[PDB]
Paper text:
The ensuing 2.8 Å resolution cryo-EM map shows that the NTD-NTD stacked units are indistinguishable from the N10 double rings of FL N until the end of the α-helix 344–358 and the beginning of the CTD-arm. The pivoting of all CDT-arms tightly locks the adjacent rings together through their CTDs, such as to generate a polymer built of layers of inversely oriented N10 rings engaged both in NTD-NTD and CTD-CTD contacts; the latter are additionally stabilised by binding between CTD-arms of two opposing protomers, in particular through a Y365-Y365 stacking.
The helical NC, together with the RNA polymerase L, its phosphoprotein cofactor P and the transcription factor M2-1, form the HRSV RNA synthesis complex that constitues the minimal infectious unit of the virus. We explore the polymorphism of the nucleocapsid-like assemblies, report five structures of the full-length particles and two alternative arrangements formed by a C-terminally truncated nucleoprotein mutant, and demonstrate the functional importance of the identified longitudinal interfaces.
Residue numbers in the entry:
A (entry chain D), B (entry chain A), C (entry chain E), D (entry chain H): 2 to 370
Amino acid sequence: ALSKVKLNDTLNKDQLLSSSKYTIQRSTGDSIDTPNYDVQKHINKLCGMLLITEDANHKFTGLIGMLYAMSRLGREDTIKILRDAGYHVKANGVDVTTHRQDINGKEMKFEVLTLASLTTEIQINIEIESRKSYKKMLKEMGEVAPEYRHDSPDCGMIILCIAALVITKLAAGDRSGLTAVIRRANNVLKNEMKRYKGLLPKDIANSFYEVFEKHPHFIDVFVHFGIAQSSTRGGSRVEGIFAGLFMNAYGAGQVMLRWGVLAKSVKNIMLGHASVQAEMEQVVEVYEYAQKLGGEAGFYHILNNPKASLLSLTQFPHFSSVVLGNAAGLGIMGEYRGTPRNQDLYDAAKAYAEQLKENGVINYSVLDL
Amino acid sequence: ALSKVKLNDTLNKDQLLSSSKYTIQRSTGDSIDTPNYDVQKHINKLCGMLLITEDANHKFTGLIGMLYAMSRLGREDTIKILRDAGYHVKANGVDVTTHRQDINGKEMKFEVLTLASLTTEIQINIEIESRKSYKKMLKEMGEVAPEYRHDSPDCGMIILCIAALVITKLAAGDRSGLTAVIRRANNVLKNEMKRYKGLLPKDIANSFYEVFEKHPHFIDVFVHFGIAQSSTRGGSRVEGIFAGLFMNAYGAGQVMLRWGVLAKSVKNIMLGHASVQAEMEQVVEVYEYAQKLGGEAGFYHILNNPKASLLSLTQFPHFSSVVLGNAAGLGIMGEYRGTPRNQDLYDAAKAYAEQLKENGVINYSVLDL
Amino acid sequence: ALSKVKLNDTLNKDQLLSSSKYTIQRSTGDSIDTPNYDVQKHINKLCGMLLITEDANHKFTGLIGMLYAMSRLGREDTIKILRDAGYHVKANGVDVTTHRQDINGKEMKFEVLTLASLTTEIQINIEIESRKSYKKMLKEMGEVAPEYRHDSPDCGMIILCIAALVITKLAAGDRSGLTAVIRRANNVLKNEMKRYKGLLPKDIANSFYEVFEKHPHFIDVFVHFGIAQSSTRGGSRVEGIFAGLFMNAYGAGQVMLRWGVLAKSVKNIMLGHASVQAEMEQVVEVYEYAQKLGGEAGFYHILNNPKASLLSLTQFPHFSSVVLGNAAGLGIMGEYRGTPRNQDLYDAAKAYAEQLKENGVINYSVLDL
Amino acid sequence: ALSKVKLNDTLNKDQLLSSSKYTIQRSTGDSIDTPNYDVQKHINKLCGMLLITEDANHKFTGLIGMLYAMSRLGREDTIKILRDAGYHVKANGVDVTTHRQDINGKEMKFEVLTLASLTTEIQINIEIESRKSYKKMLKEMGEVAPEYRHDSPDCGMIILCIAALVITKLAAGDRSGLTAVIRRANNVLKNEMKRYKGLLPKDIANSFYEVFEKHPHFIDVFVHFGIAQSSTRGGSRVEGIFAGLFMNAYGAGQVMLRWGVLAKSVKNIMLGHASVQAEMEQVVEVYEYAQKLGGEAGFYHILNNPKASLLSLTQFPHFSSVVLGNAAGLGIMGEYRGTPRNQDLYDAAKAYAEQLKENGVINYSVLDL
RNA sequence: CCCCCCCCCCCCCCCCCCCCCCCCCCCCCCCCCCCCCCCCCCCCCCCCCCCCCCCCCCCCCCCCCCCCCC
RNA sequence: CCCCCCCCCCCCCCCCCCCCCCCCCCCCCCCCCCCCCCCCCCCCCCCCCCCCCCCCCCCCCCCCCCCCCC
């Protein structure tokens, strides 16, 4: 029977990758600092001092946000995440200590952290800039409120909201989503961009881009922190904003699956073409694979999971071209920089999707009605 | 088959969030006072003294109501709630002690509580104001009744009724439901607003708004206290009022689901439009998700649960516009400040819902009858 | 039942027009000459003399061709045709006689016809021109053949072939099909355009246009002559050419019916639009009417039959626009000067018909396959 | 319903042509000789004298064969045929008479016919040539047999066999089938081409071509004579040869119908193409029309019947191209000078028909087997 | 990003039952005859036949993926 | 009372055909036998029986219809 001349390549590749009986273990290189719940207050203080500092220097904001996320997770869970990701990690204990230095010819008390990645001078200078900006702004408006201070419990979570936007745009492969990050961080968080002098979305976004590029394990740590944070029973409104912006990253890098479901929903006719119907077997194969994967598959491209390539639909040029055409016809493709590889099917689907709005729907009374 | 080109994104996101294998643990900052059953009588006395004090100062009423709720729960359950919500809490023991001070040049006996959040001066001044207001009102009417006193066992529960109204309106994101809270606290509790001189709904509502804004864990504590209180076998009539006002908050922030069920019930025709039928698959997805969640989902938006965004229907502009139009046509939309994002479907549904009252119903004898 | 809210207007109009119990009888004005079988040879001689005359004057060729057709029909059938068409006719007997005149100072014998419409001078001058052209061409090539002479039995039928082309293009309402007539008379009849010096398609076509414009009863006579000629058991090859060119006129003025059948055959999707399906009832009404009429309906527009307007499809703007779009997309519309009255449906159908050639066909596996 | 958007143009045209209520009547011009059964022996004698005359002059053989056919039919049936064909005929009586002339200075008795088309000198000279050729051949071989004489009763029927071959090739429109006529008259009738000195196929074929070109009514007369001859109960072997060669002309000019039936029989796949299936409705229309016509339709193109154009299949370019391709692939198209108007379908069908011989047949186990 | 409206609940009437009535009552041990069963003939098998025998390595192309908005 | 609007229609391209091909061809009479058919016994019926039988007139009331608008 010709019906059994078939090969389930996607499922077989998945079974090969999921049934490996040997494991690799990478070496991060530089030692990882693992803060615990103890220093969460101090890291939040540092984030607040960065936020209240106008004309601020955000060169180290990405690392400080990563430290805050790791302190929220806790040392045990951070270590367990790093092992489960397949890393050899030098767990570095983080504890708070005092440092005494004379600036302006006056003895001064600073409370800093033992971070191998972040030197004492940097934290001291962050405090100095924050203090003098606070002095100037207190002079210019008289009395402060808990709104204008580093002691707010959500100062770190605003920085992590910026990180969540960066994560949403990470799947583009470079810093091309920086403009989108800035635009969305101006739409969202506009009250904060009033309230905090140093909340500069572009600088923080660039810092997080840099830290994610240099340390790929921080992407894994941040994704699992975002999943753990989104699994809480509740929280403040800033944590709700972070959860909403983080789940905006679900399915990033897999827009074609959603647009294919959309093209099925609007019932585009060019799904009835000969070549599309030729590829439909493996297309349904891919969709069933995505469903069997389920929730974990939504962050494959952000995490650079090796099995991300199994979810691709560009390996079916005709179906992909029809899907892109339908997306462009419905007016939702935007600046999507993926290009069709069957221009004719793309144009036909685009035209039909455009007439799907002036000419509402097409019946199929043809053929017996 | 084109029927298997589908993705269950809502369910996959829920499974991802519910199957997390790492947890975060937040730090509240300031220490939490955890009163036990021992001081419930004293906290109720404090609430009664606040209530019988005319021209009262309600700056601290929200914290005192929170303390009363936590004392009703007990220290064990309050601590367990705070852990289950994912908080690091400094459990502060609350016990009663005496303080002696000379006011009016006379030695005076006061019995106060060891609360870190509430200083002794504040409790002393509350007692002073209550005592002199009691003296003045006793002078002006001769003899008091158990109706006019702080020893009533429901004085704290009236304050918690005001808190329940504030909770009902918390999902609006700000203090825009203050007018509704005042109106409902005048409709309900009018006998009390006679009986208690200091029962000022606006001041207590503002105090509870402030305490819920500053301490997001108090929202969790109060919601679980309200659920535990509503699980009792019975109580007084004020506790019944509190239970009725608290379950008025169930489903807050999710009005569109109820209005969609309503639009299905009145059988609005614009549910048969092309785009609405395109979105119906994911709409049924969302409704099945809400049902699988069940009872716990009714307080997701009040608690700022991260999975609250999964219940949204505004991600389907056509269905949402039809639902808003049907609600506006039936005359129940009120001042709902959500706006349609398909004006045409909104207007069509509104018009049909309006003719659903003069022109009772429409048969579908068209097509074969 | 809403299914019986229907009116069969086309069929009712046809029954009203076909069941009239009173008749009109028009008056042609000028007397009609009715030649019989006797003078068929002489009229064919006259046509041959016109054909062999180079640089000829074809002012009277249309009338002579009409006389030849009427002589082929016979006087009885010509009279019966004129009565059945509803005309009052002065039947004029045509017989041959001799006329003697002196040209070049020499007595000369001419044999002419008693035609009221055609004077003796005209026939004499036709003979003179033919004779001297024959003399010149005999001088220039030495000896003639039966190919180069007026005695050929098909000289009149060539002129009637030109008349048949003019009839094919008569439905345009004016002399706009003259170029098409000339082009087709050059493609066909090229051997004759060699063989006959005076076979000028444009002059003969203009003469036939003039005679059909002045005498509308000659259109009826010629159409019924063409039907009678095409009902013969056989004939020469020129008669076969005439029959082929005459049946090319069948269905002239009713191209939209054929193009609608074509759009049904290529299964254009825009036949499934809402408005097209609204009009489909009356469209099927018109097609059933055309079929009930049958063969006689193919010459309604040429004859200016009053019931020609009942076969129109432009009374359904959406279906007509779809049909024109399908015709233009398939590349067969040419210079058809009818214009769509629904531009959107026209463009949509044109686009789909164009993709019907690169993208062969579209299956309807959508909806359950 | 879209299924009733249809027009039966072929059948409607046939009904229009078959239901004409007026008739034309052509004039042959020159008078028709109508021999009766009386002079059949003399006309057969003339044909035999032409046949036994070596190096003969066949300028008049076509007319003599026509006279023999008309004498076999009889005067009554010849006249009735000419009327039924729609001709005005001057019936000329043919009778035998004697003419006396002195050749070689000697009185000589000749018995000739009163034929207006054939002068006495021609018959006399035919007899002279036959007599002297007979004398020379009798001298050269001594004694004659009934094989070598003009008195054989089939001498006229051999000439009519040559006429039958010419009729088979008449549908080509010119004298392009002359080579085929000569080849078939050499294959058949080779014993006669031994036996008769003047049986020159090319000269007789040219004479019959000429007479059929000049007198189109002789084609009708000969076709009906051949039908009447083929309706006899029996005859000689030469009459059987004539019947076989005459029914070889049945269906001449309609090869595409037979080749389409053939392409259906060999089950060519390109009959499943989209455009072919578009045209299949009108193709089946044409085939049903041909079957309804039946036997009379086999001589439409030979007789130049006006309804011959209704049997054409070239009005369906795709089906015609597939049919020509299948014919060329099977190796039976020969020098058929009709050309495809869809080269692609022609080539595809030709290729499949070629692989129909090395690769016997193709099953359709594809799709469920 | 999400969200945004309105809304305490309840309210009536109401005991139920009520009579009459013990049940049973007759007749009737069961069985009973005749009959042992079996009975013949018959070892089974018997031939022919080892099996195998050809041809044949397989492979060979192209291809990172992603990119929108929220 | 009813009615009340708008609206001529048409418009393109296109003669058709074209090849090959006589048919047939062998063998063959059929039949063949046997056979008359029938054959017996037998009349049928047979009794009893007239049928019917009573009671019974039927009916009984009320009630014109209609009414608007168009």
